[PDB]
Amino acid sequence: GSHMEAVQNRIVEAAERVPGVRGVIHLRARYVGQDIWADMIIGVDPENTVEQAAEISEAVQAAVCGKIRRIESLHVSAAARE
Amino acid sequence: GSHMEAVQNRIVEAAERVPGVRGVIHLRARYVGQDIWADMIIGVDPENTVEQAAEISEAVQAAVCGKIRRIESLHVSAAARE
């Protein structure tokens, strides 16, 4: 839906405002009732530690869920991006 | 509607993140089709100039409309608040 594209835009913008995010590589969002469940991959510095990449991913989870209240499940993984 | 309260929450938060805003005193939002038309009053420093208060109001108009894409009309006035 178009309202869905509005939501996906908000998710991408929210994630890209988090320190350490090198773009959103992938985002799949779906409605479960009125709730959004979503899975996303962010880009990170290949020289970040795995621990740092996990910290960024968690920061993205908190930022995105803080800004888009209809999200009730959000998984964030990371991949190296230059 | 409840989705309307979500929109009003987003409007208030967006406005209160603008430098110079001393809360949202009043916000009336209504749907015109799928678009939001809204009228709001912000609080400002009573010692700001009228020109400064107009600048803050314009900054609020741009910030709110930038964050909530469904808004197609937004009027922002200001009043002194301590």
| d(CA B20, nearest CA chain A) in Å | 22
- Angle between helix axes A50-67 and A2-16 (nearest 10 degrees) is 140
| Residue A25 to residue A37: CA distance in whole angstroms | 17
> Looking at the partner chain, which of B6, B9, B69 has a beta carbon nearest the beta carbon of A6?
B69
Experimental method of this PDB entry = X-ray
| Structural domains of chain B, count | 1
**Neighboring chain A residues of B6 at a CB cutoff of 8 Å:** 69-70
Selected residue of A4, A5, A10, A35 to mutate for chain B interface (largest B Cβ count, 10 A)? A10
Report angle CA B64, B37, A30 to the nearest 5 degrees: 65
Question: Sign (positive/negative) of CA torsion B16, A62, A1, B4?
Answer: negative
Question: Using an 8 Å Cβ cutoff, are A25 and A79 in contact?
Answer: yes
How many other C-beta atoms can be found within 10 angstroms of the C-beta atom of residue A81?
14
How many other C-beta atoms can be found within 10 angstroms of the C-beta atom of residue A51?
8
Question: Sign (positive/negative) of CA torsion A10, A12, A13, A18?
Answer: positive
CA proximity to B65, closest of B4, B10, B26: B10
CA proximity to B12, closest of B50, B34, B43, B51: B43
* Side chain identity at residue B71, one-letter code: I
Beta strands in chain A (DSSP E): 24-32, 35-44, 71-80
CA proximity to B44, closest of B19, B65, B20: B20
- Which CATH number belongs to the domain containing residue A79 in this structure? 3.30.70.1350
> Looking at the partner chain, which of B6, B69, B70 has a beta carbon nearest the beta carbon of A69?
B6
Cα-trace Rg, chain B: 12
| d(CA B67, nearest CA chain A) in Å | 9
Beta strands in B6-82 (DSSP E): 24-32, 35-44, 71-80
* Boundaries of domain holding A68: 1-82
